[PDB]
């Protein structure tokens, strides 16, 4: 795959969780680490880009994926 | 003579350590199918 | 024969220091979500 279908976004204040579908801007409300209320009313925006706007940056390309970084590997050496 | 061996029994010392012999082996993620 | 292991018991010496594994540590400020 070139992207990804289906993501799920956590913004650095805790505040928004946010779903990247397709073709619409998905925004959530993060008032406590782990709570949903539906009382929420949720934002859908139509920006339009297409497929999900998201690049992955694999360290390492493998064929059968098992992607792993540069500190985990040398984790027993160190 | 009844005693097992030659009596040069040995007692297993240890440095005060428990040991957690699992640190860096359960942070890998399922990349696969499952199997 | 009822003392533990080889009668070879040991004392755990000490340089005269309490320890404070912590001057280092809680300097950390927390820059994430709070997790």
Redesign the interface.
Known sequence: DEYPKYALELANNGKTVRLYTDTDYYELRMPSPGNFPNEQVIKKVHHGVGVCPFVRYVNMMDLDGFTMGEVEYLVPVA | RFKRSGGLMT?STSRGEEGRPWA?KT??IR??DGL
């Open positions: 007692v860096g942070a890998y990349y696969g």
